Design a protein around this ligand. Structure first.
Ligand code: NDP
Ligand code: D09
Length: 186
């Protein structure tokens, strides 16, 4: 509800997204990791919350919306009502972050996850205060529309280990990848 966790999978050249779509074919096992981490609350009774840009929301198949057992926030300057299935609409990241700390909510809500789009990652990453970046390194270049903001290594500490995160190289369909956790405190 207070540290901001961003979670992203990123190609070697920093690619995320191609034509409203991922740069790589379905990595189904990497999705498992995304689901367990964003979903796994640390208090029974409380749900984790996800915040995403509007194009990311409509890029999720409708049969998977909202992301289940998580409170779903959509950001949009043009929508007036939440998208069907979304729990909240907010007009800026700041609105979203203020809502989450409200007494009525903060107590239904445990961890806050930024799950994308480029725009939402950039902004989260200009937040002062405690940030974590859960970065899937896809060890391979893929042709991309959009890209992930530079990870300033003076600002972000690579955690050597992190609870429940396995550090060995993984592979699925000939695509190698690994899980990293970065941290910017304060
Ligand atoms: N590799 C990965 O792990 C991930 C990749 N993706 C990919 O990333 C790409 C999507 O990125 P992108 O194009 O940036 O899409 P976004 O999901 O960030 O959507 C951008 C839109 O979200 C709203 N928005 C963004 N920032 C704000 C803000 N600060 N306040 C209010 N509203 C905001 C929009 O609303 P409006 O037009 O309604 O005002 C803006 O047009 C796709 O290719 C997708 O597949 C997505 C998640 C993860
Ligand atoms: C448009 O994509 C999706 C389609 C269906 C369901 C969920 C997602 C999202 C938003 C998938 C992700 C958003 O941030 C992520 N970080 C990592 N490491 N892995 C992921 N799969 C995602």
């Amino acid at each position: 509800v207070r540290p901001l966790n961003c979670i992203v999978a990123v190609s070697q050249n920093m690619g995320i997204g191609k034509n409203g779509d991922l740069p790589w074919p379905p990595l189904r096992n990497e999705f498992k990791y995304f689901q367990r981490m964003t979903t796994t609350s640390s208090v029974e009774g409380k749900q984790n919350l996800v915040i995403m840009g509007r194009k990311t929301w409509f890029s999720i198949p409708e049969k998977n919306r909202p992301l289940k057992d998580r409170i779903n926030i959509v950001l949009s300057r043009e929508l007036k009502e939440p998208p069907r299935g979304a729990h909240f609409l907010a007009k800026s990241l700041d609105d979203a972050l203020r809502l989450i700390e409200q007494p009525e909510l903060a107590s239904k809500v445990d961890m806050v996850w930024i799950v994308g789009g480029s725009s939402v990652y950039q902004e989260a990453m200009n937040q002062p205060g405690h940030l974590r970046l859960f970065v899937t390194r896809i060890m391979q270049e893929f042709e991309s529309d959009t890209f992930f903001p530079e990870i300033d290594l003076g600002k972000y500490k690579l955690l050597p280990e992190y609870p429940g995160v396995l550090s060995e190289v993984q592979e699925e369909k000939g695509i190698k990848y690994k899980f990293e956790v970065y941290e910017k405190k304060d």
